[PDB]
Amino acid sequence: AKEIDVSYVKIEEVIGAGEFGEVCRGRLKAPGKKESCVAIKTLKGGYTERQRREFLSEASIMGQFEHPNIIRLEGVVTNSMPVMILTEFMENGALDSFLRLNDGQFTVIQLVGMLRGIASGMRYLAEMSYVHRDLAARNILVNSNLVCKVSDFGIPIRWTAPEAIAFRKFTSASDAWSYGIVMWEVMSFGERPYWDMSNQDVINAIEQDYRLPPPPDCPTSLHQLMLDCWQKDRNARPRFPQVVSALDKMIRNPASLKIVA
Numbered sequence: 001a002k003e004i005d006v007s008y009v010k011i012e013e014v015i016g017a018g019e020f021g022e023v024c025r026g027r028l029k030a031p032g033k034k035e036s037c038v039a040i041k042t043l044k045g046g047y048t049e050r051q052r053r054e055f056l057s058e059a060s061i062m063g064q065f066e067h068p069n070i071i072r073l074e075g076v077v078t079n080s081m082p083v084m085i086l087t088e089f090m091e092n093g094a095l096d097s098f099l100r101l102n103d104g105q106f107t108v109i110q111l112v113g114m115l116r117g118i119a120s121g122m123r124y125l126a127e128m129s130y131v132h133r134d135l136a137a138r139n140i141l142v143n144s145n146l147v148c149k150v151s152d153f154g155i156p157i158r159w160t161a162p163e164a165i166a167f168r169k170f171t172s173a174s175d176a177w178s179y180g181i182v183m184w185e186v187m188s189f190g191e192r193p194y195w196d197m198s199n200q201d202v203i204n205a206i207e208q209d210y211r212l213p214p215p216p217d218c219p220t221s222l223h224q225l226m227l228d229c230w231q232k233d234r235n236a237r238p239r240f241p242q243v244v245s246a247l248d249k250m251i252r253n254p255a256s257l258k259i260v261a
Ligand SMILES: CCN1CCC(Nc2ccc3c(c2)/C(=C(\c2ccccc2)c2nc4cc(OC)ccc4[nH]2)C(=O)N3)CC1
Pocket: 015, 016, 017, 018, 019, 023, 039, 071, 087, 088, 089, 090, 091, 092, 093, 094, 138, 139, 141, 151, 152
């Protein structure tokens, strides 16, 4: 629905590499509108015709959404080559590597505001009956004001709920499990979940009631919220409306974030 003329894009600088090509920063400018900043995903010569429709599957599903915590589709370039998806440019890049860079350097309140934006984007996706399946801190992007936005549209054992591993039943409740792992990643400044362990070590521990402990300095009520998301029984996990309001309660009552083991 958003076919964009190729003379309207100036590619400026490579900034990353997604699974099927380079990712660049750039400028978009169409007649009658302001110039804006965009990220540009490309797919260069040499690919199948179902590989092309899977690249562009990202843009079709992404053009469905409109929410301040979901990355925006500016448009596509298909009628020519190279093929392109244009999205919103995100100054502080991926969330896990942004926090490792900034380790120990943001307040609990700021970290909670990140998690509340991600939960809000999750709450909106669940309301539209879209199940993400790949929620992880590496698929959340951060802009100049620290606003967090879910990307990656279109299995990661340690982010995935038990019943989704065993039976391939992927729901919003299994996304809630993945969300609790994102809480842990955020509160541990981008440490890798289950550090040392292998995928089968992780699965064996979970089935045997092991759960990631609180990160150093982590409020007790954030950890409980993680443990609520990690219940074996998928129907006892909080849904995302409940998650966002638990976090809102923390932000209005910041004396509850001072208490720790
Ligand atoms: C498998 C992981 N997923 C994560 C999201 C990727 N898609 C995507 C959509 C829109 C984007 C970026 C990346 C984006 C990036 C970025 C590019 C590639 C990987 C991860 C992030 C970006 N990286 C940056 C690094 C920077 O230096 C620290 C500054 C701004 C950056 N923006 C950016 O600004 N806007 C597809 C791959």
